[PDB]
């Protein structure tokens, strides 16, 4: 049964499992191939990762302007699958699993 | 593909399809056999239907106190399928269909 993902603050649906790619328990994050277009804004600034191998732009929630994850623009070879995809911080989102 | 239903005001998920019973095109409403536990509050007043064949109590969104529908407590025999069941007003809700 699929889950839907929401901003924790305002409760805007950012996207669902189904468009899921991969999770990183190390990073405390998960990555979707797709997101709700109006719910999410990728910011117009490139920031250094902490490591700092990667380059990303923040994605903010459209409703409450929380920084809820990252779009990774440049990556090493091993982090290619999260590149140009929607990476959400677990800390910032909640999941609703459907019934039945 | 399933949908998920939220209050229009606060974005609280009140329930998903799958727990759906029936829809009425005439009155802008639909009916679910289930709702999210603390999502919804059924009020302490018995009100007459518009006809008024039925008796209902209002259901309110827990977070924002919007009247988003009705729990029909008493019905004629043909409207038994919606009795003791969660009837949401379409006007007060919004749907999110899952992708893929
Ligand atoms: Zn938000
Ligand atoms: Zn609400």
Numbering used by the authors:
A (entry chain A), B (entry chain B): 19 to 118
What are the paper's exact sentences on this?
Mis18 is a key regulator responsible for the centromere localization of the CENP‐A chaperone Scm3 in Schizosaccharomyces pombe and HJURP in humans, which establishes CENP‐A chromatin that defines centromeres. Here, by combining structural, biochemical, and yeast genetic studies, we show that the oligomerization of S. pombe Mis18, mediated via its conserved N‐terminal Yippee‐like domain, is crucial for its centromere localization and function. Amino acid sequence and the predicted secondary structure analysis of Schizosaccharomyces pombe Mis18 suggested the presence of a highly conserved N‐terminal globular domain (residues 1–120; spMis181–120) mainly comprised of β‐strands, followed by a moderately conserved C‐terminal α‐helical domain (residues 121–end; spMis18C‐term‐α). Here, we show that fission yeast Mis18 and its human isoforms, Mis18α and Mis18β, possess two structurally distinct domains: an N‐terminal “Yippee‐like” globular domain and a C‐terminal α‐helical domain.
To structurally characterize spMis181–120, we purified recombinant spMis181–120 as a mono‐disperse sample and obtained crystals that diffracted X‐rays to about 2.6 Å. The structure was determined by single anomalous dispersion (SAD) exploiting the Zn anomalous signal from the bound Zn2+ ions in the crystals. The final model includes amino acid residues 19–118 of spMis181–120. The overall fold of spMis181–120 is formed by antiparallel β‐sheets: a three‐stranded (β1‐β2‐β9: β‐sheet I) and a six‐stranded (β3‐β4‐β8‐β7‐β6‐β5: β‐sheet II) sheet, arranged approximately perpendicular to each other. The two β‐sheets are held together by a Zn2+ ion coordinated via the C‐X‐X‐C motifs from loops L1 and L5. Although these proteins recognize substrates as diverse as nucleic acids to proteins, they do so via a common cradle‐shaped binding pocket formed by β‐sheet II. The asymmetric unit of the spMis181–120 crystals contained three copies of spMis181–120 assembled in a linear arrangement via two different interfaces (interface I and interface II), resulting in two potential dimeric structures (dimer I and dimer II). While the interface stabilizing dimer I is formed by the stacking of loops L5 and L7 of one monomer over their dimeric counterpart, the dimer II interface is formed by the stacking of β‐sheet I. In contrast, dimer II is stabilized by highly conserved residues (V22, I31, Y114, and L116) and has an extensive binding interface (as compared to dimer I) with a 1,431 Å2 buried surface area. Consistent with this, the other dimer II interface mutants Y114A, Y114E, and V22E also behaved as smaller entities compared to the wild‐type protein when analyzed by native PAGE, thus demonstrating that the dimerization of spMis181–120 is mediated via the dimer II interface.
